[PDB]
Amino acid sequence: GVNEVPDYHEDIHTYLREMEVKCKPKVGYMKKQPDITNSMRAILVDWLVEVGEEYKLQNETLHLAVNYIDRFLSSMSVLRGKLQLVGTAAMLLASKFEEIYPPEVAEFVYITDDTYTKKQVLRMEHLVLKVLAFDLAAPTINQFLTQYFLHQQPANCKVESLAMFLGELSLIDADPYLKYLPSVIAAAAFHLALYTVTGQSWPESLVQKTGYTLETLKPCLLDLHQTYLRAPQHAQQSIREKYKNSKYHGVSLLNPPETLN
Amino acid sequence: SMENFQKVEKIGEGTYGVVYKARNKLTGEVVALKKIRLDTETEGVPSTAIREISLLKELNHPNIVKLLDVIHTENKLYLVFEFLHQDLKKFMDASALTGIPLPLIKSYLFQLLQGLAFCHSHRVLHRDLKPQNLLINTEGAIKLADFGLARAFGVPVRTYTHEVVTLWYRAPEILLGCKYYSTAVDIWSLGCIFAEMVTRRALFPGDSEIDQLFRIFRTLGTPDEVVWPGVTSMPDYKPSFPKWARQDFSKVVPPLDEDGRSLLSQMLHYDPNKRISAKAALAHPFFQDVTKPVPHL
């Protein structure tokens, strides 16, 4: 049916793959930021997750916001005191891009606890737009996941939730996830959600779609498997809490498999 | 910033405000300048502009209007576009007593479908196709314009803004208030535009939402489950709807040959799933003899 744009799925996929390379942040920009760290950034993203839940934003919006932040920080040095201003400005842009009903600018100045003024938020908005050159339609993990889901037969909502959950966990830790493209993280999160819930692996049909095999997805799956196992102990917990709720089928409460062939 | 541009005349207004025709004093290029006020103390850069700029920066095609530059100040955004002579609505109006030649109609439709197929292939819904948003030049070209209400979609689509597309060009899925719509809504609008190029009158000029549906049903026949499965389960569907028969396209678009009738009808299928795609339409027998004539201007 036309909701799955059959006449266009292949072209769209091919384009998002080329586009995810151009929207790709510099791996290890963090070492080149004198005053900010992966830990600080983890705190930032985790906070954006909360903001996301409090304003009932789309998951896609949160994923766009992190793309914007990582590209911005690939180009500009930012002091720790201004890190949150970047993050707030990027969620405002993400919201304006993606949401039917974005929160008003005032609401974004309130979530910072008046750390910043409205003028800072709007000026940073402009600066972020200039630095990204208005290239905001970035392919996300979610855009690849919803596509990979169509290869299910039948659809399993717990598979879908779980792959969403693992996908977001990756947002938090620039090490190692900045080295993996969204379409890779997506693929690893889906195989691993599928393995956990059904016992099944990455399908042949998606091998044919993506070109990725379990061999080529191994590095990313090793990292992602470890993140999942350690999630209970991670300093940042907002995504686990988010995905305990009924809405996402309680998947964060599931026991990860101890191993995978 | 704008020192190299000389304004020539207001060429109209729009969402952001005034659109001016201007000339590059150094290169001689004629352009359209869209000035967008930035709400520097209140709301910042409009979502409408963020969407138009970002999506147009991706879409490079001969049948989509070209965004040439984006000039920043602290207080304003100026969008520099290619300049095109006029829009399709003005052209149709101007052709009221001469009619429009069929080869030119076919050419324009073919080009619109090429532009649209390019959007769809690139995950963009236009969501505002109407004559006033289609720009022609003096050389026989036509281009999709005003991406103000466009939207990058994912696969499968999710719920987007319902208040979309001018009423006359609005697909029945949106009118019946369905959870999800897709690329098909754009094909509907083009179908309405094909009709309108042939007759130079709008196909479904509704006064209201209920009126718009009735006008569609009067012409295409009141849909039922056989024609459109799940229609009667749609939120805004009413079992009291009068049951009108379909009208022969020989009365709807008399000038149109059997090929045009066939393509027009596939473009106006009720069921969004059965409605033809831009890709598919490009292969229709209507286009086998397509050429690119110049308009009379």
In whole angstroms, what is the distance from residue B113 CA to residue B124 CA? 14
Cβ contacts from A onto B, under 8 A: 108
Question: What are the start-end ranges of the H helices in B59-101?
Answer: 88-94
Radius of gyration of chain A (CA): 18
Spatial separation of the C-alpha atoms in residues B20 and B6, rounded to whole Å: 10
Question: Alpha-carbon distance A95 to A48, whole Å?
Answer: 12
Strand partners, B36: B77
Write phi, then psi, for A136 (nearest 5 degrees): -115, -15
Contacts of A5 in chain B (CB under 8 A): 120, 153, 155-157, 182-183
Look at the alpha carbons of B24, B27, B32, B37 in this order and tell me if their dihedral is positive or negative: negative
- CA nearest B137: which of B96, B190, B83, B68? B83
Residue with tokens 């019946």: B176
B101 lies in the same domain as B207 = yes
CA-wise closest residue to B88 among B121, B65, B119, B58: B65
Q: Do residues B95 and B71 both lie within one domain?
A: no
Nearest by CB to residue A143, choosing from B43, B50, B154, is: B154
DSSP helix, strand, coil percent of chain A (3-state; round to 5)? 65, 0, 35
Q: Are residues B19 and B110 in the same domain?
A: no
How far away is chain B from the Cα of A141, in angstroms, using its nearest Cα? 11
Q: Measured between alpha carbons, how far is A169 from A171 in angstroms, rounded to an integer?
A: 5
**Burial degree of A196 (CB within 10 A; 0-12, 13-18, 19+):** buried
3-state secondary structure of B94: helix
Strands (E), B14-165: 18-24, 30-37, 67-72, 76-82, 86-87, 124-125, 134-136, 142-144, 151-152
Could you say which of A92, A97, A134 has the minimum Cβ distance to residue B70?
A134
Phi (first) and psi of residue B67, to 5 degrees: -85, 120
The tokens for A53 are 């839940």
Contact A160, A150 (CB under 8 A): no
Q: Could you tell me which residues are beta bridge partners of residue A34?
A: none
Elucidation method: X-ray
Distance between alpha carbon B13 and the CA centroid of its chain, in Å?
18
Residues B10 and B78 in one domain: yes
**What CATH number should be reported for the domain holding residue B168?**
1.10.510.10
CATH topology of domain A25-137: Cyclin A; domain 1 (1.10.472)
Chain B partners of A8 at a C-beta cutoff of 8 Å? 120-121, 123, 183, 277, 279
CATH of the domain at B65: 3.30.200.20
CA separation for the pair A233, A235 (Å, rounded): 6
Q: List the domain boundaries for chain A.
A: 11-24+138-261, 25-137
Q: How many CB atoms lie within 10 A of CB B141?
A: 18
Answer yes or no: do B122 and A92 touch at CB < 8 A.
Answer: no
Q: Using CA atoms, how far apart are residues A186 and A180, in angstroms rounded to an integer?
A: 10
Instruction: Name the residue among B51, B53, B155 with its Cβ closest to that of A5.
Output: B155
Cα distance between residue A71 and residue A25, in whole Å? 5
Domain that holds residue B81: 2-85
- Which of B34, B59, B85 is the last residue before a domain boundary? B85
Task: List the alpha helices (DSSP H) in chain B.
Answer: 47-58, 88-94, 102-121, 172-175, 184-199, 209-220, 249-252, 258-267, 278-281
* Domain end position, chosen among B58, B85, B112: B85
Interface contact B155-A147, CB threshold 8 A? yes
Report, in angstroms and rounded to the nearest whole number, the Rg of chain B calculated over CA atoms. 20
Residues in chain B whose beta carbon is closer than 8 A to a beta carbon of chain A?
A: 38-45, 47, 50-51, 53-55, 57-58, 70, 72, 74, 120-123, 152-161, 180, 182-184, 272-273, 275, 277, 279-280
Alpha-carbon distance B78 to nearest alpha carbon in chain A (angstroms):
13
The domain total for chain B is 2
B244 and B151 assigned to the same domain: yes
Domain boundary among B69, B85, B101: B85
Cα distances from A7 to residues A153, B4, B120, B155, in angstroms, run: 21, 44, 9, 12
Let me know whether B70 and B115 are in one domain.
Answer: no
Answer yes or no: do B100 and B118 share one domain: yes
Task: Specify whether B165 is located in the same domain as B228.
Answer: yes
Is residue B16 domain-shared with residue B152, that is, in the same domain? Answer: no
* Partner-chain contact A3 B154, CB within 8 Å: no
Mapped onto helix, strand or coil, the DSSP state of residue A117 is: coil
CATH C-level class of A11-24+138-261: mainly alpha
- Those residues with Cβ within 8 angstroms of residue A57's Cβ, 6 or more apart along the chain or in another chain: A51, A91, A95, A99, A103
B140 and B70 together in one domain:
no
Interface mutation vs chain A, best among B40, B60, B155, most A CBs within 10 Å: B155
CB contact under 8 A, A2 and B42: no
Q: Are residues B22 and B148 in the same domain?
A: no
Bridge-partner residues for B37, per DSSP? Answer: B76
For an interface test with B, give the residue of A105, A134, A152 to mutate (most B CBs within 10 A). Answer: A134
How near does any CA of chain A get to the CA of B271, in Å?
Answer: 10
- B68 with B211, same domain: the answer is no
Whether residue B259 lies in the annotated active site: no
The vertex-A151 CA angle with A147 and A152, nearest 5°, equals 115
Catalytic residue of the set B69, B93, B128, B207: B128
- The count of other CB atoms within 10 Å of the CB of residue A155 is 9
> How far is residue A187's CA from residue B215's CA, in Å, rounded to a whole number?
48
Q: Which residue of A has its CA nearest to B122?
A: A12
